[PDB]
């Protein structure tokens, strides 16, 4: 697609267009979207320092290189996945408290363990919280509360895949399948 | 219908009550916390070292993502033997596995090498007792170092009869099957075996394995595919309503219970914080006021409650027998909120008979200090910490006289999970003995 | 399938028919209107004066908001005794209470102080007969001044057996329990008692009350909480479809019935205005044309109809027996539209046996003038006003030979409520006697 | 779970396999195409000439708009007699009629005037055998010129017993009821007769008709109203899931089957293209590798498969018996994928007993060349064309040794329709004989 | 017709609940329909109609299953060629001769 | 095990010497001969109800007889076995 933003000034068009790139997600392919986000958000581009060599010049800032993702991330991804996976309500007994993706434990704190795999990396996120808070999820928005700061990002589930917005780059997350791979 | 609370949360007599209670709930959370380590970070590291998941790591991986888990008797063996035998070296509990509520029983290899102490056996059996009565498929995570190197077998008998009754038995061997143990998987409809790791000492050579796995993770993954093909349908029939929360907060229960045993209180304040919408329809409120009786719903499940509110007298016994007669007629589960403070027997008989013969699922929670616990075979029996050295909840709980000490603020949740587990099985019609009129 | 009407609504022969009919429906609406006053505005004022709700005010408060109410036998006792005994002093009928269809039976204290005349007993029983056969929980609003100061007990017998069969019995005493009456609440699973108002003369002193109420309104509110905890599930199984209205208006039924008894008409025009979508699939249309037989649906409920269209002859008897054989095979309710105008018995036998043994629910409506009414024990039996001094619908209806005279334009609604009430109970499979081939 | 295919669709060894297979599927499509003409365009024109619908035109009009139709044994009689007797002159198959799956059986009047050859009888019966075992209502489109002018009756016996078991029998006479035939409608709960066209020679004169029709179209319309009032409910209980397609295309099955009988292949590649999501949970994969066994779902229906992958040896027999023991415990249908290539009997016994006694519905498809077909009475038995002059699928299929030769690329669809037809009937619990341990 | 008759006998044995005793001695299922037979043995056994085999000869081809499929098998030793006690694993009683066998 | 565990006819057990095992399979009764096996003495178990008593070998037939007959007051249930591990 072609994304076009109009503004009264050029900063407006730029800032708007940038917002349209933030609100756009695309998964299942590699996309020049992360690239474009950076261009509009580049000091060089705001300053209109344009010439036909702009691309090959600032390439270092436009085409960075990945950073493994922090434990800051896996906790977020887990919460997200876990919450995109309800629990199976059986026609047998529809309101069964056993359908909670809660992690409820008797006297101790909520325990949930997930074997997630993003890109070509895999972690065993263990979610613990004697504090029900932290994350929630509505529609395609993961609402997180890193003690004090309530932030919200994209988290979209399509099939057996969870596409999470992280640092202006869509990351595909899925559950590890012990059987599939052992094979 | 709806109950009005006479309890002042922001009072001082209250905070006093919540004081000792929270105090105890915390003693519990700590002990359990300890008990959670099995044989200390020592053995646990050694175990993880051999590349194996810990019993509780297995249990959490086996379960459905986020699933609740109702651990049974964690205080098992506590201060009963010489040294420690955390949870008797076996972790039991009900949890969802491929949409099915299953009885999970695993050996904590890190507790005397997962060797059955008398209470270990008693607990393993107790789990099956529950699995049978509630028709809960079984999943045994085998990993043991003996039946005591320096009562059992009954165990296999159970596997056979449940299998015969259509309650699927599944074994997952991720360790040693020393002594008896070797039969546990032998006696299961389906066994998942870990290869070149799980020492099978007394797949196609033991002839006791139907699925082979590289590691503990693969194994549990397979165990899940097993439950995935049980073609399971629950048999309990009930007029379930959509769940509705109680009008007052769970925690307020801590303040309700007088800090002093003597100091009388209205148990109705306990009911009000457990049942749906706090609606309790009391039966014969002015007769046998020592025994509160009424109908209600909990997580949409209709229940008939009977809570002790003093000493059981004649009129109470009658009141109670009549009420249980009603519940059985209608096929409604029974909730016993027991706190036993303290010619006569002529009527107590009626209650006994009603309670003994009633065939709907029964649940009991001791919230205080005839009738009595394990005597009437309720599906489950839980104790609040405030309940009563040789009378400490830990005493009994540690010897399987009950299924565990639970957090008062969670009773509604526990009773809910339980009621639902129970519903896997049908609800038999009742036949009473000859009531001594 | 779909029936084409040969009836001209804007005709003159029509208006003539609608003439006498509407005429009669109005005679009825008036009498009932009268009957609605029990013992005149006299006694009624006296009653309201004592601060009590009237029997029908109670019935309307007990019911679910807006609920239909199917009153049974209102013409009871009419012109049978010396003076009046409106509806025999007892108001019976089926209505929703907490989502459950219940048999309600109340004493009209304002009719000889609610004293049982023979027909009062006959009617009270008749209600239970219905409550048993259709598995309808019972709610007795007790308020009586005797069993005749200047047959019964059978009543209590019924309470016991229904209770035994799991059909919950509830008593609400809002008045006097004189003579027998005292047992009515004694014999109920749950009794709601009005305190310091409802003279209990032959809670914890009568020992026959399980709930105490300040006034009639409180009482009925409690009675509702009672039904609220019946954990009730209906047992009738059927392939119900979503309801579809008949192609022609209800009222047109008034014009269909010839004003003259003799003047033959096609009963199919009556069916067409009762069944869903007016689709009637006739069976053996050219054989035994005196007996119309076919399948259809009414409020989504599948029914097998048999309506008289002349004199019953051999071929008809056969046709009919075969048809009922079909219905029973399939577990479809039977609808008898009876209008009996007037070697042979060899075949009539077959019909008798089919009709006698058929175990699906049966409903009968007399719309005209072997077989016959209460002889085959249909769940209910209603009469249209046009049906036949000692042969007047009022005659029989007043002596409980049927469950009431109904408005032809409402037959579809009545049959619908009935069919559904019936469905609280299962639908037994059928076993026929030896058919005389 | 999920299977990985080792089959290369764009390979050459593949195209070779798909070569001979497609070749055969096409031989079949042609023969059937021929068989579709009954007695040639000759007789067919003559028939349409008399204003009558052809047997297959009737079948398509009777069915619900767009309904699938599972024709049974079309190759019946093929090259068995002197001349041709297309499909033995009777077209059988399961199809929807007013939302109900029915067994339809029609005489092709254009094949020797619809005269029963021995195999015609065998097939008519075979259809009923299926209708009984799967509780499928029957609809006979009668049109016959004899029971052979130049074994039967058993037929009527069947009509009576199914009628007795509540499996509705319907007759639609649109032609001649010569000889026996006359009883077919006589023996049906409901008969639809065509008037002044359908020669009734050995409504109210034959006394064997309950509905009269102007023409074949009217008749079939009525036959539909008949099924419309069966008040039918299926009795098979199962944990059905929503359907999920197989990972690989249907047609790829043509390439999978080696073109050479000898050349061994993995049957798992056949399963992978039939089951939902291609997920197959194999049981004892490393034991008795000659018999592949596992669970899966097909159109949401859970099934337990057993496919031949070589010669049946001891370990295999055991593996198999254990697996069927599991399936029966859980009430899961059995799928037999048979391709029989080729001390011992001690264990083969166990398999026999398991297979013989297993009471869940069983389905069998021959996809190759003890155990064996019609020996264990599976609900249905189909053959792939590649399967094995006196050993040709046509040979057997033509003599009713199976229910037809089917397109490999449709096996999943056929098994699906079948499984569902089967579900009209309950799923009995199993009792096994004495297993020779 | 041998098969048809063997089956016919079982049909009768099932319908009338008559225990079965098969005196096995066969030279084939035709060297130059069956199996249904074993199916019957299994179902009658399941219905509690006891199946007994007495092998006093050859159990050629199918035959070998007849005793395999019986609750109890009596085998004649060193006389009754068992070709397709504890080696066939299909015998629960061993007999010297036909008379001993039938006695068992 | 499965056969012994599931078998529903009345079962009787007598220890006459020294898997399977006693009270594990719930036989109607369980008796021990004196010759059977300090902490292994028939008296040990018999004294703790691990069995229903030590009996005279010369009376076993009589005891089993009385027992079998007592048992017959109750019906004899049909049996359902678990999944036999073939």
Residues A16-36: b if buried by 16+ CB within 10 A, e if exposed: bbbeebeeebeeeeeeebbeb
Cα separation values, C390 from C79, C80, C171, C399, Å:
12, 12, 37, 11
Chain C residue numbers touching B315 (CB-CB < 8 A)? 204
Coil, strand or helix at F10: coil
Question: How many angstroms away from the CA of D231 is the closest CA of chain C?
Answer: 6
**Which residues constitute the domain of residue A91?**
66-183
Residue B197: closest CA among B179, B214, B185, B183: B214
Please give the order of strands across the beta sheet that includes A116-118: A121-123, A116-118, A170-175, A161-165, A149-158, A141-146, A135-138
Give the whole-angstrom CA distance, residue C18 versus residue C97.
37
**Could you report how far apart the first and last alpha carbons of chain C are, in Å?**
32
Per the annotation, does E31 bind a ligand?
yes
Which residues lie across from C191 on neighbouring strands?
C171
- Taking CA atoms, D368 is separated from A58, B406, D339, D384, in Å, by 66, 61, 4, 8
| Nearest alpha-carbon partner for D61 in D127, D145, D139 | D139
Enter the DSSP assignment of A45: H
Please name the residues in contact with D298: beta carbons below 8 A apart, sequence gap of 6 or more: D274, D275, D276, D335, D412, D415, D416, D419
Integer Cα distance of D212 and C283 in angstroms: 10
| Beta bridge mates, C382 | C365
Q: Which residues contact D39 (CB under 8 A, 6 or more apart)?
A: D84, D86, D108, D110, D111, D112
Instruction: In whole angstroms, give the CA distance from residue D427 to residue D333.
Output: 9
**CB count in 10 Å sphere of residue C437:** 6
Instruction: State the Cα–Cα distance between residues A21 and A4, nearest whole angstrom.
Output: 10
Residues for chain C: how many in total?
A: 437
* Chain B CB within 8 Å of residue D333 CB: no
SS (H, E, C) A88-110: CCECCECCCHHHCCCCCECCCCE
Chain D residue at shortest CA distance from B229: D295
Longest dimension (CA), chain E: 37
- Angstrom distances, CA of residue A117 to CA of A122, A146, B61, D419, E13: 4, 23, 15, 38, 64
DSSP, res B423: T
A102, B64 Cβ separation under 8 angstroms: no
Rounded Cα–Cα distance for residues B403 and B374 (Å): 10
Query: How far is E88 from chain D, CA to nearest CA, in Å?
Result: 4
Q: Kindly provide the residue ranges of all beta strands, DSSP E only, lying in chain E, ordered along the sequence.
A: 20-26, 51-59, 72-76, 93-95
Q: Which two tokens stand for residue B144?
A: 């043991």
Q: Where are the alpha helices (DSSP H) in B263-406?
A: 268-271, 314-330, 345-357, 393-397
Determine the distance from the C-alpha atom of residue D339 to the mean position of all C-alpha atoms in its chain, rounded to a whole number.
18
Q: What angle do CA C387, C393, C394 make, to 5 degrees?
A: 155
In chain C, whose CA is at the least distance from the CA of D233?
A: C239
List CB contacts of B299: < 8 A, sequence separation 6 or more.
Answer: A95, A97, B243, B276, B412, B416, B419, B420
Beta strand B90-97 with B69-72 is: antiparallel
Burial class (CB in 10 A: 0-12, 13-18, 19+), A68: exposed
Do residues D22 and D264 lie in contact, with contact meaning Cβ atoms separated by under 8 Å? Answer: no
- Which of B286, B287, B302 is facing C229, going by the closest CB pair? B302
- The closest alpha carbon to E7, from A168, A8, D375, belongs to D375
Domain with CATH 3.90.226.10 in chain B: 1-35+234-437, 36-233
Closest C-alpha to C28, from C387, C325, C362:
C387
Angstrom distance (rounded) from CA A112 to CA A78? 9
Touching, D vs A (3+ Cβ pairs under 8 A): yes
H-helix or E-strand spanning residue D355: helix D345-357
Residue whose entry in the numeric block shows the structure tokens 């096994």: D432
Q: Phi-psi bin for C241: left (phi > 0), alpha (psi -120 to 50), beta?
A: beta
* Chains E and D in direct contact, meaning 3 or more beta-carbon pairs closer than 8 angstroms: yes
| Structure tokens belonging to residue C398 | 């007043």
Strand order across the C334-338 sheet: C281-282, C291-298, C301-308, C334-338, C362-366, C380-383
Sign, CA dihedral C108-C110-C114-C115, equals negative
> In Å, what is the CA distance from F42 to each residue of F17, F37, F53, F55, F57?
11, 6, 9, 10, 13
Residue C10: CB atoms within 10 A of its CB come to 7
Cβ(D302)–Cβ(D332) below 8 Å: yes
With contact defined as beta carbons under 8 Å apart, do B141 and B62 qualify? Answer: yes
Find, among C312, C274, C276, the residue nearest to C291 by Cα.
C312
Pair of tokens at residue C339: 């209008």
* β-bridge mates for residue B301, sequence order: B298
Query: Which one of F4, F6, F86 makes the best mutation probe of the D interface by having the most chain D beta carbons within 10 Å?
Result: F86
Q: Which residue bears the tokens 């008990």?
A: B35
- CB of B273 closer than 8 Å to CB of B253: yes
Alpha carbon A100 to its chain centroid, in Å, reads 23
Q: What CA–CA distance (Å, rounded) separates B402 from B400?
A: 5
Q: Which helix (H) or strand (E) holds B141?
A: strand B138-144
The whole-angstrom separation of Cα B118 and Cα E47 is 43
What is the chain D residue with the closest CA to B165?
A: D329
Cα separation, D257 vs D369, in Å, equals 12
The coordinates were experimentally obtained by: X-ray
Distances (CA, A) of D315 to C158, D63, D296, D336, D345: 65, 48, 22, 18, 12
Beta strand residue intervals within B262-341, DSSP E: 281-282, 291-298, 301-308, 334-338
Fold held by D1-35+234-437? 2-enoyl-CoA Hydratase; Chain A, domain 1 (3.90.226)
List CB contacts of C84: < 8 A, sequence separation 6 or more: C39, C77, C111
CA distances from A99 to A112, B432, D74, D151, D380 (A): 14, 36, 50, 58, 39
CA dist F77 and E86 (Å) reads 33
Q: Are B and C neighbours with ≥3 CB pairs closer than 8 A?
A: yes
Element (H, E) at B254: helix B252-256
- Helix H or strand E encompassing B255: helix B252-256
Task: Tell me the C-alpha distance between B203 and B209, whole Å.
Answer: 4
- DSSP alpha helices (H): ranges in D171-228? 183-186, 216-228
- Across the interface, whether the CB atoms of D435 and F84 are under 8 A apart is answered yes
**Paired tokens of C152:** 């019964």
Q: Alpha-carbon dihedral of residues A68, A72, A76, A82, nearest 10 degrees?
A: 80
Q: How far is B358 from C165, CA to CA, in rounded Å?
A: 17
Q: What contacts F66, CB < 8 A, 6 or more positions away?
A: none
**D145: nearest Cα among D121, D119, D114:** D114
Tokens found for residue B288: 């046998």
Q: Give yes or no for B81 touching F (CB within 8 A).
A: no
The minimal CB distance from D210 to the residues C283, C315, C330 is found for: C283
Is C131 part of any known ligand binding site? Answer: no
- 3-state SS, residue E62: helix
**CA dihedral defined by E89, E92, E93, E94, rounded to 10 degrees?**
0
D333 phi/psi in degrees, rounded to 5: -60, 150
Q: How far is residue D94 from each of residues B56, C389, D426, measured CA to CA in Å? A: 53, 61, 18
Q: In this structure, what CATH number is given to the domain that contains residue A139?
A: 3.30.700.40
Helix (H) or strand (E) holding A123: strand A121-123
Q: Are E55 and D335 in contact (CB under 8 A)?
A: no
**Selection from C149, C151, C64 nearest residue C104 by Cα:** C64
Contacts of residue B107, defined as CB under 8 A and 6 or more positions apart, other chains included, come to B55, B89, B90, B114, B141, B142, B143, B144, B175
Record: contact C285-D212, CB cut-off 8 A: yes
CA-CA-CA-CA dihedral for E82, E85, E86, E90, to nearest 10: 70
DSSP letter at B52 equals P
Asked whether E100 and D356 are in contact (CB, 8 A), the reply is no
Return the residue matching tokens 């005709």: C11
Q: Do A112 and B66 touch (CB under 8 A)?
A: yes
Please state the three-class secondary structure of chain C as a single string: CECCCCCCCCCHHHHHHHHHHHHHHHHHHHHHHHHCCCCHHHHHHHHHHCCCCCHHHHHHHHCCCCCCEEEECCCCCCCCCCCCCHHHHEEEEEEEECCEEEEEEEECCCCCCCCCCHHHHHHHHHHHHHHHHCCCCEEEEEEECCCCCCCCCHHHHHHHHHHHCCCCEEEEEEEEECHHHHHHHHCCCEEEEECCCCCCCCCCCCCCCCEEECCHHHHHHHHHHHHHCCCCCCCCCCCCCCCCCCCCCCCHHHHHCCCCCCCCCCCHHHHCCCCHHHECEECCCCCCCCEEEEEEEECCEEEEEEEECCCCCHHHHHHHHHHHHHHHHHCCCEEEEECCCCCCHHHHHHHHHHHHHCCCCEEEEECCCCCCCHHHCCCEEEECCCCCCCCCHHHHHCCCCCCCECCHHHHHHHHHHHHHHHCCCCCCCCCCCCCCC
Sign of CA dihedral B203, B208, B213, B216: negative
DSSP H helical segments within D50-181, as ranges? 55-62, 118-133, 154-164
D15, with CB counted inside 10 A (0-12, 13-18, 19+), is middle
Query: What tokens does E19 get?
Result: 């225990």
For the domain C36-233, what is the CATH code?
Answer: 3.90.226.10
The CB-side HSE value for A121 (13 A sphere, CA atoms) comes to 15
Q: Does F48 touch chain B (CB under 8 A)?
A: no
């Amino acid at each position: 697609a072609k994304l076009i933003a109009w503004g009264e000034t050029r900063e407006e068009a730029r800032q708007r267009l940038l917002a349209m790139l933030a609100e756009t997600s695309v998964g299942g392919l590699r996309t020049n979207l992360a690239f474009l986000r950076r261009i509009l958000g580049h000091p060089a581009f705001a300053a209109a320092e344009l010439d036909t060599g702009f691309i090959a010049r600032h390439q270092d800032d436009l085409l960075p290189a990945p950073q493994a993702l922090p434990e800051h991330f896996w906790q977020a991804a887990a919460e997200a996945w876990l919450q995109s996976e309800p629990g199976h309500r059986r026609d047998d007994d529809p309101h069964s408290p056993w359908s909670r993706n809660d992690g409820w434990r008797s006297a101790l704190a909520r325990e949930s363990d997930l074997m997630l795999r993003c890109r070509d990396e895999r972690r065993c996120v263990r979610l613990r919280h004697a504090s029900p808070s932290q994350y929630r999820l509505d529609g395609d928005d993961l609402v997180s509360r890193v003690d004090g700061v309530t932030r919200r990002s994209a988290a979209l589930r399509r099939g057996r895949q969870l596409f999470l917005e992280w640092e202006g780059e869509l990351l595909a997350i899925e559950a590890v399948d012990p059987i599939a791979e052992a094979e | 219908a709806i109950l009005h609370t006479q309890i002042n949360p922001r009072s001082a007599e209250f905070a006093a009550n919540a004081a000792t209670m929270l105090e105890q709930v915390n003693a519990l959370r700590t002990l359990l916390g300890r008990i959670h380590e099995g044989g200390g970070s020592a053995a646990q590291a050694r175990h993880s070292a051999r590349g194996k998941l810990l019993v509780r790591e297995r249990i959490n991986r086996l379960l459905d993502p986020g699933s609740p888990f109702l651990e049974l008797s964690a205080l098992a063996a506590h201060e009963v033997y010489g040294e420690e035998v955390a949870a008797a070296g076996i972790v039991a509990g009900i949890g969802r596995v491929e949409g099915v509520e299953c009885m999970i029983v695993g050996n904590d290899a890190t507790v005397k090498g997962g060797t059955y102490y008398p209470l270990t056996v008693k607990k393993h059996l107790r789990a099956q007792a529950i699995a049978l009565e509630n028709r809960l498929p079984c999943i045994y995570l085998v990993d043991s170092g003996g039946a005591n190197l320096p009562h059992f077998g009954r165990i296999f008998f159970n596997q056979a009869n449940m299998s015969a009754r259509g309650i699927p038995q599944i074994a997952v061997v991720m360790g040693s099957c020393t002594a008896g143990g070797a039969y546990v998987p032998a006696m299961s409809d389906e066994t998942v075996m870990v290869r070149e790791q799980a020492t099978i000492f007394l797949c196609k050579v033991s002839g006791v394995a139907d699925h082979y796995a590289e590691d503990d993770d693969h194994a549990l993954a397979i165990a899940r595919r097993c439950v995935a093909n049980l073609n399971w349908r629950k048999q309990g029939q009930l007029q379930c309503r959509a769940p509705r929360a109680p009008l007052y907060p769970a925690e307020e229960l801590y303040g309700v219970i007088p800090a002093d045993s003597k100091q009388p209180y209205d148990v109705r304040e306990v009911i009000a914080r457990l049942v749906d919408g706090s609606e309790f329809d009391e039966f014969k409120a002015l007769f046998g006021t020592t025994l509160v009786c009424g109908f209600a719903h909990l997580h949409g499940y209709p229940i008939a409650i009977l809570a002790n509110n003093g000493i059981l007298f004649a009129e109470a016994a009658q009141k109670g027998a009549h009420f249980i007669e009603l519940a059985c007629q209608r096929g409604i589960p029974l909730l016993f909120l027991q706190n036993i403070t303290g010619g006569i027997a002529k009527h107590g008989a009626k209650l006994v008979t009603a309670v003994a013969c009633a065939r709907v699922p029964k649940f009991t929670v001791l919230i205080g200090g005839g009738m009595c616990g394990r005597a009437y075979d309720p599906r489950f029996l839980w104790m609040w910490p405030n309940a009563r050295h040789q009378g400490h909840p830990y005493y009994s709980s540690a010897r399987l006289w009950d299924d565990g000490v639970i957090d008062p603020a969670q009773t509604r949740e526990v009773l809910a999970l339980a009621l639902s587990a129970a519903l896997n099985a049908p609800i038999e019609p009742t036949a009473f003995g000859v009531f001594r009129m």
